[PDB]
Design a binder for these strands. Structure first.
Ligand SMILES: [Mg+2]
Ligand SMILES: [Mg+2]
Ligand SMILES: [Mg+2]
Ligand SMILES: [Mg+2]
Ligand SMILES: [Mg+2]
Ligand SMILES: [Mg+2]
Ligand SMILES: [Mg+2]
Ligand SMILES: [Mg+2]
Ligand SMILES: [Mg+2]
Ligand SMILES: [Mg+2]
Ligand SMILES: [Mg+2]
Ligand SMILES: [Mg+2]
Ligand SMILES: [Zn+2]
Lengths: 124, 107, 242, 96
RNA sequence: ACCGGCGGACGGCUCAGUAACACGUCGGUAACCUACCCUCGGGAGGGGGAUAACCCCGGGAAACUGGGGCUAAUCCCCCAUAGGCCUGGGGUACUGGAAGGUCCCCAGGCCGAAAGGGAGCCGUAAGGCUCCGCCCGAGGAUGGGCCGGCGGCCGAUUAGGUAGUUGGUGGGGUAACGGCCCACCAAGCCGAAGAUCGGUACGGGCCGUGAGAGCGGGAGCCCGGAGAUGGACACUGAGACACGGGUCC
């Protein structure tokens, strides 16, 4: 499984994208939204990406993602399944009209091989 | 007491909140006179009034009758065969929209 | 109206009291809510454009209104939809003229020229009267407006009396009672625009309205509804009427 | 052609005067706007820059025409009040 | 260009459904809702918050749509006061034909306002002087909801029909009265003066014809009703279960 990573540094507003595949991407298969994991264990030359010194034992947390067909993930839905539900706000629906509700296809919480993009932010 | 009719009130009092003389009911609109032809249901009567209708083509008349269901307060307690006065009111049931306010001639 | 308020008005369905050519166009101005009712008033655009002739088109009538050239009951009115009704005063100060709005013998609204002095007063018939918080009295007039009086004055005002009011200051200056011998002007019905004196008053049971007999100048007696009889004087008119 | 003035009315609210007139001309074509304007401004002592001709109308079997014109005391008031099409059609301004 | 405000429920189209309080007409609401407008009486004190736009990185074949950074309001949320609603006990100020209504005084509760914002001059500044605005209360106006009496097709080779059916008592629900819906108690309700069922059809102003009495029609314009491929059901809003908005079959 190949994951395309979007790493966001909250102390700068700057983000970097790298691609990670192989045994490294296998560990990340199974974590939900809102849980941390050290970057040294995940395996990344972090100081090279941003050109900045970093504190030791830093870590990152999973914030979101998109699947192979282009559908995003929803924090409030459990598991890795894909669903089609009626929405009025939140991730996966931009309303455009007062009280508008629309049915949309969305993903779940657990990471899966179908997922492509993974958005995380650095937590010092 | 007067309720705008100009007629004498009943002999005795009652506790019915749906009574226009001793309760909170209000009367407004048409006032009809008729004859009772049924009194079986509790506190309900049927009143029938006759009138003539003109047929223009035949220059003659025919007789028609109007039947109305009305509420019968306990202080009045009208029965079959007597002449009554009835007054229009707010809806009281599916078919009842009038109240008996006086017996004119006991049968 | 399947789902909401109506906002349009066809010419053919316009009120019968307006002077308007009913087949010349498709649409008429739908008047805005305000003082009088639909049967006794007319939008101000027809006064500026159709009656007086100070403008040819709606666009230049609106420019005249927005500059503040027309006064109704002493106040500047800019809305071309504003309803102008019975007993109002229309004033043009840049030309120095004043009119009172009154119904015709046929029931149509017309403009009656008046003096500059008489333009300061508006008669108001008392339509309703009520108690209000603080134990004061609110008077509700025929043109929809309201006034407050103290509890000590409660015996000097009753429904169907007329109050002469100084405008736009809204100050009372005279109370004209409804009684026998008073002078009245009819505002609605078959005997509209006739005037005279009160002879008798009659009442009926169960909410049917009360009726008045009136003697005119030539000595004839006629009846009308009490609420159609607008007091204008004691034994002579206090305003100029045709 | 012979011109007769029927009515001259003052409109202070708009700031203009409104002029109705007749032209008698047996055996001649309908007079042009330029000729009518020149005759009118000579006959009333008007600045021709603020004189607008609303219309000239001929009738079925008649030897005369009826006309309507307006005269403003101020050029800017004229440009603010009158529609663009009538000022162009009268040669007061140029069509873009 | 975006956030924010108002409008998009009118106007336009058609006549499928409907024999019904759908329509015409006279009355009723003391049994009700109403943004925009008019008059009068009052108010605008103290706090907090995110986020579009914009910059970094993107996903998806597309329709669409994700994470991080940062920001304002007439945007949003709290505290206070004013105010609103329910019930119990007194007093009699008002309207009306008639007070379960209005007004005054005690008492137990619950709900609960606001943008002094914007523009222009006189201002050295201080502060005025106008214009457009914000919130509450009383009444009107405008647009509607609901109810009643009366009036207008064909069939007996359709004669009996109804069982929440008809009425009562106690509640719930609704903006509001109501078998509108429930619990309990009765046997009522409609019908040869044609019930019920079946047929056909949007109703009226009007239109064709005839000396008239009559007979026939009701597309085009105006007023009322209904519908948006068929059948169901919701969100926002003063107003919709919404023709150019949403959900299922
Ligand atoms: Mg009444
Ligand atoms: Mg729409
Ligand atoms: Mg519509
Ligand atoms: Mg049928
Ligand atoms: Mg009806
Ligand atoms: Mg019927
Ligand atoms: Mg509060
Ligand atoms: Mg109840
Ligand atoms: Mg049909
Ligand atoms: Mg028919
Ligand atoms: Mg057609
Ligand atoms: Mg189609
Ligand atoms: Zn009784």
């Amino acid at each position: 499984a190949t994951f395309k990573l979007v790493i966001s540094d909250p102390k700068t507003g700057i983000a970097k994208q790298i691609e990670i595949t192989g045994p490294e991407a296998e560990k990340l298969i199974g974590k939900r939204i809102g849980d941390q994991i050290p970057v040294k264990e995940l395996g990344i030359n972090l100081n090279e990406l941003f050109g900045k010194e970093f504190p030791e034992d830093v870590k990152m947390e999973i914030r979101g993602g998109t699947d192979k067909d282009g559908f995003p993930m929803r924090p409030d839905i459990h598991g890795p399944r894909r669903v089609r539900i009626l929405l009025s706000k939140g991730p996966g629906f931009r309303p455009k009209e007062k009280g508008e509700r629309r049915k949309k296809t969305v993903r779940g919480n657990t990471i899966s091989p179908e997922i492509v993009q993974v958005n995380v932010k650095l937590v010092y | 007491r007067d309720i705008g009719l100009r007629i004498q009130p009943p002999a005795e009092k009652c506790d019915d909140p749906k009574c226009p003389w001793h309760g909170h009911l209000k009367i407004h609109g048409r006032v009809f006179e008729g004859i009772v032809v049924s009194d079986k249901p509790r506190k309900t009567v049927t009143v029938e009034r006759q009138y003539y209708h003109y047929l223009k083509k035949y220059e003659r008349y025919e007789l028609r009758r109007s039947r109305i269901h009305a509420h019968n307060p306990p202080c009045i307690n009208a029965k079959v065969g007597d002449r009554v006065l009835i007054a229009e009111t707010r809806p009281l049931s599916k078919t009842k929209h009038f109240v008996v306010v006086a017996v004119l001639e006991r049968a | 109206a399947r789902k909401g308020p109506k906002r349009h008005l066809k010419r053919l369905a316009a009120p019968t009291s307006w002077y308007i050519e009913r087949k010349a166009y498709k649409w008429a101005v739908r008047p805005r809510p305000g003082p009088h009712n639909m049967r006794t008033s007319i939008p101000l655009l027809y006064i500026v454009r159709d009656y007086l002739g100070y403008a040819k088109t709606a666009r230049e009538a609106r420019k005249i209104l927005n500059e503040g050239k027309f006064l109704v009951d002493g106040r500047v009115r800019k809305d071309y939809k504003f309803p102008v009704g019975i007993m109002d005063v229309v004033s043009i100060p840049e030309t120095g003229e004043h009119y009172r709005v009154l119904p015709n013998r046929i029931g149509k609204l017309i403009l009656h020229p008046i003096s500059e002095e008489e333009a300061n007063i508006k008669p108001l018939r008392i339509r309703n009267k009520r108690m209000v918080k603080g134990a004061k009295i609110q008077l509700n007039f025929h043109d929809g407006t309201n006034h407050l009086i103290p509890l000590s004055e409660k015996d000097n005002y009753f429904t169907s009396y007329t109050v002469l009011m100084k405008v736009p200051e809204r100050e009372i200056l005279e109370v004209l009672p409804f009684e026998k011998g008073a002078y009245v002007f009819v505002t609605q019905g078959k005997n509209v625009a006739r005037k005279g004196r009160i002879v008798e008053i009659k009442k009926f049971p169960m909410g049917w309205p009360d009726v008045v007999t009136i003697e005119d100048e030539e000595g004839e007696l006629f009846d009308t509804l009490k609420e159609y009889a607008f007091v204008v004087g004691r034994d002579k008119p206090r305003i100029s009427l045709p | 052609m012979e011109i007769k003035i029927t009515e001259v009315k003052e409109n202070k609210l708009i700031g203009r005067k409104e002029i109705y007139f007749e032209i008698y001309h047996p055996g001649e074509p309908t007079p042009s706007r330029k000729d009518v304007k020149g005759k009118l401004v000579a006959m009333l002592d008007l600045n021709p820059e603020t004189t607008v001709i609303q219309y000239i109308r001929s009738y079925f079997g008649s030897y005369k025409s009826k006309g309507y014109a307006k005269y403003y005391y101020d050029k800017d008031r004229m440009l603010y009040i009158e529609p663009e099409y009538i000022l162009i059609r009268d040669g007061i301004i140029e069509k873009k």
